[PDB]
């Protein structure tokens, strides 16, 4: 890192006000229809959101037992922002190691825990369930068939990006990025807190972001200082944060924290979702860091819209029969 991260946390120059403060009961489908989910949202309490979370004192070791001690987990080396791997037992040992005895800074932001015992302990906001493409567009018998709790692509039967557990030690930093496929993201601070820097997806900012990705000078440049307006905001314990498609953001962890969150595509911000996918294409993002089965999903979206509006199906007879069997349950 060729810049000083502590001055970015202290300065008052990231003074934009992009985030709308909202009540949970107002975050409904009508709200999505009216606004297109274009504004970052903070819900200071969870009332009316329909979320559920684990035991308040749930530990990383409890996560381990849910997902499997020998499960391989993707870990971020904070200093290089490169990916490494270790088992969940090893990660847990790291998280439980005293700060002084940890010779490296590591972050877990990508533990997707669907199809484990943890999955039923976390419920997403109700409104996300109404609009998420995975739940509403992907063939249901395929999604229900998923047995693999890892994100092994050859076993993956649908885009397995719904429910992630993030485990971050004091001092972790995730550099500026846009979430894969232009997904929107919800984030619940179960324990601890986070600091986000937010940059809006204007044409100019997206151009800068893409050039920054292509430049090979990313550890060298703090993107928040290259743009006209950037908001630094702190998320406290119990907050729920929603980030729209395309938003360029970086995240710092001021204390040991446990977060639950997830990604979703939806039908009301498609142009930006496609814009982000094309940036990934041009900057040669490896497949593993992308939204699985993105264009497949897009095809299923078109089919669902034609079917729900016109009652004309473009699925194969076998997929139609699988769907009717689901309907008879």
């Amino acid at each position: 890192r060729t810049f000083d991260l502590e001055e970015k946390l202290q300065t008052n120059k990231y003074n934009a006000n992009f985030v709308t403060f909202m009540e949970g009961k107002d975050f409904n489908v009508e709200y999505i229809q009216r606004g297109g989910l274009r504004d970052p949202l903070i819900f200071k309490n969870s009332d009316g959101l329909g979320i559920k979370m684990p035991d308040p004192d749930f530990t990383v070791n409890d996560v381990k037992m849910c997902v499997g001690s020998r499960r391989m987990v993707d870990v971020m080396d904070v200093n290089t922002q490169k990916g490494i791997e270790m088992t969940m037992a090893q990660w847990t040992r790291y998280y439980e190691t005293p700060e002084e005895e940890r010779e490296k800074l590591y972050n877990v932001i990508s533990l997707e825990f669907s199809h484990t015992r943890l999955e039923n302990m976390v419920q997403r906001p109700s409104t996300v369930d109404f609009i998420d493409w995975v739940d509403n567009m992907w063939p249901r018998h395929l999604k229900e068939s998923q047995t693999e709790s890892t994100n092994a692509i050859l076993e993956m039967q649908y885009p397995k990006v719904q429910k992630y557990c993030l485990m971050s030690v004091r001092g972790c930093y995730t550099d500026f990025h846009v979430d894969f496929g232009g997904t929107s993201v919800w984030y619940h601070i179960h324990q601890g807190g986070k600091v986000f820097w937010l940059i809006p997806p204007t044409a100019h900012n997206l151009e800068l972001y893409e050039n920054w990705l292509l430049s090979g000078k990313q550890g060298d440049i703090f993107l928040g200082d290259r743009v006209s307006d950037c908001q630094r905001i702190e998320l406290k314990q119990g907050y729920t944060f929603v980030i729209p498609s395309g938003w360029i953001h970086a995240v710092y962890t001021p204390t040991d924290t446990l977060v639950f969150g997830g990604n979703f595509l939806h039908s009301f911000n498609i142009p930006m979702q496609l814009k982000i996918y094309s940036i990934e294409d041009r900057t040669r993002v490896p497949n593993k860091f992308r939204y699985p089965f993105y264009y497949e999903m897009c095809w299923y979206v078109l089919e669902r819209y034609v079917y729900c509006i016109t009652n004309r199906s473009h699925l194969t007879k076998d997929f139609q029969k699988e769907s009717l069997s689901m309907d008879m349950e």
């Binding site: 993707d74 922002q81 932001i109 050859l154 397995k160 979430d179 990604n263």
Partner: peptide, 11 residues
């Protein structure tokens, strides 16, 4: 070494 998808990481 199974290939994975949907890994969250800055590029």
């Amino acid at each position: 070494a199974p290939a994975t998808g949907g890994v969250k990481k800055p590029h």
